Amino acid sequence: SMNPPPPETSNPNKPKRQTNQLQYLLRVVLKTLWKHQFAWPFQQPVDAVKLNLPDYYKIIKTPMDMGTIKKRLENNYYWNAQECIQDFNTMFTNCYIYNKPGDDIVLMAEALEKLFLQKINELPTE
Ligand SMILES: CO[C@H]1CC[C@H](n2c([C@@H]3CCCC(=O)N3c3ccc(F)c(F)c3)nc3cc(-c4c(C)noc4C)ccc32)CC1
Structure with a gap:
């Protein structure tokens, strides 16, 4: 099997804003x-x-990764912060779907997820 194309990271027909x-x-x-x-x-x-x-x-039918997430942020792809947070969560749970629970890569994703949740708790108001 070939790889699929990567997720879309830019869409000129989507509105754009900085928050x-x-x-x-x-x-x-x-x-x-x-x-x-x-x-x-x-x-x-x-x-x-x-x-x-x-x-x-x-x-894995909803692939997601941090390179894609960063490009989405750089291209103003997300309107709401929760859209970005959802993509991080999808990345973590994809790892937990595909891999067996004791696997090294799962433990690594769990460590990243723990840090992610800590940083999300420091999200600013507005
Ligand atoms: C830019 O080149 C890439 C770097 C990451 C490499 N890689 C590696 C490399 C090569 C394969 C063996 C190995 O030990 N890798 C590795 C090497 C160094 C690391 F610091 C590390 F965390 C992992 N493992 C990957 C695992 C996954 C993965 C995810 C995410 N969810 O399920 C699986 C399986 C994804 C990428 C992996 C593959 C080539």
């Missing part, structure tokens, strides 16, 4: 997770061809 919460999601939340020791597997779409995982995209 304090979206800026925080980019400049603090995403940046902190990006620099975490376990970030590398989550920095781009899963290359199931390279990883020899022919069933990945048979099981």
Whole structure:
């Protein structure tokens, strides 16, 4: 099987706005997770061809990753902060769907998710 194309990251037909919460999601939340020791597997779409995982995209139909999330933020793809938070959650739960619970990559995603939730609790008002 081929890989699917990556998720859309820009849509000129979607309205665009800057908000304090979206800026925080980019400049603090995403940046902190990006620099975490376990970030590398989550920095781009899963290359199931390279990883020899022919069933990945048979099981995962809503792929999401931090490279896509960051591009979405940079392209003003999200109107509401909750849309971005949803994509982070999708990334984590995809890992928990595809992989067996004791697997190293699941433990790594759990560590990233714990830090994510801490940073989301510091989201500013507005
Ligand atoms: C830019 O090149 C990429 C970097 C991440 C590489 N990678 C790796 C590399 C190569 C394969 C073996 C290995 O140990 N990897 C690795 C290497 C260094 C790390 F710091 C690390 F956390 C993992 N493992 C990946 C696992 C996943 C994954 C996700 C997310 N959900 O389910 C699975 C399976 C995704 C990517 C993985 C694949 C090539």
